[PDB]
Amino acid sequence: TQGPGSMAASGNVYFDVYANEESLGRIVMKLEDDIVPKTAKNFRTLCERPKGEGYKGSTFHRIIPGFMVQGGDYTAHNGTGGRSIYGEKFPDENFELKHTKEGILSMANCGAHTNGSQFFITLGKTQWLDEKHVVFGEVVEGMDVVHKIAKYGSESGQVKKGYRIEIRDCGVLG
């Protein structure tokens, strides 16, 4: 029996990731709204907003094989920018979730209580980040697309010359 099914997964968000004009595929993330509601809200909202006001059309600007891939700087594209939906830096909501495995979605920051819009996805267990970065979700489809992203990085985090690794579209399923 053939045909598409309706949506099970509501609230899950996705990134369609591109290396220049080549599709790398889709990453789908589950957010832990019950555990970190404001952190989850910030990220989901930034997925739904238009280009220039959220993640749509932004890049993975720091890509470190064996460690993590980082994006969310949709204003400066270099790690110095980004803005949360609250208008500025927001507190670490809690550290209940831990960096236990590959595919963990966590907030980038520049110290205690400095959450904006930058995030990373881990390429392994990174226990040294526990209690320093707020974990708010995980990759549930397209972990292999995260490993593809890593092919375009380096020890230093610099992205391969000639490449922009872009979140070409993003949103909420539903």
UniProtKB/Swiss-Prot annotation:
A cellular-component GO term for this protein:
cytoplasm
Q: Name one Pfam family in it.
A: Pro_isomerase
Query: Where on the tree of life does the source sit, at the highest rank?
Result: Eukaryota
Q: Spell out the disulfide connections.
A: none
From its record, what is one biological process in GO terms?
A: protein folding
Q: Which residues form the PPIase cyclophilin-type domain?
A: 14-172
Indicate where this protein resides in the cell: Cytoplasm
Q: Which reaction does it catalyse?
A: [protein]-peptidylproline (omega=180) = [protein]-peptidylproline (omega=0)
InterPro entries (alphabetical) = Cyclophilin-like_dom_sf, Cyclophilin-type_PPIase, Cyclophilin-type_PPIase_CS, Cyclophilin-type_PPIase_dom
The UniProt keywords, alphabetically, are: Cytoplasm, Isomerase, Rotamase
Q: Which Gene3D superfamilies match?
A: Cyclophilin-like (2.40.100.10)
Q: Which PROSITE patterns match?
A: CSA_PPIASE_1, CSA_PPIASE_2
A single GO molecular-function term is: cyclosporin A binding
| EC number from the UniProt entry | 5.2.1.8
Q: What does this protein do?
A: PPIases accelerate the folding of proteins. They catalyze the cis-trans isomerization of proline imidic peptide bonds in oligopeptides.
Tell me the protein family, please.
Belongs to the cyclophilin-type PPIase family.
PANTHER family recorded for this chain?
PEPTIDYL-PROLYL CIS-TRANS ISOMERASE (PTHR11071), PEPTIDYL-PROLYL CIS-TRANS ISOMERASE D-RELATED (PTHR11071:SF561)
Name this polypeptide is given: Peptidyl-prolyl cis-trans isomerase
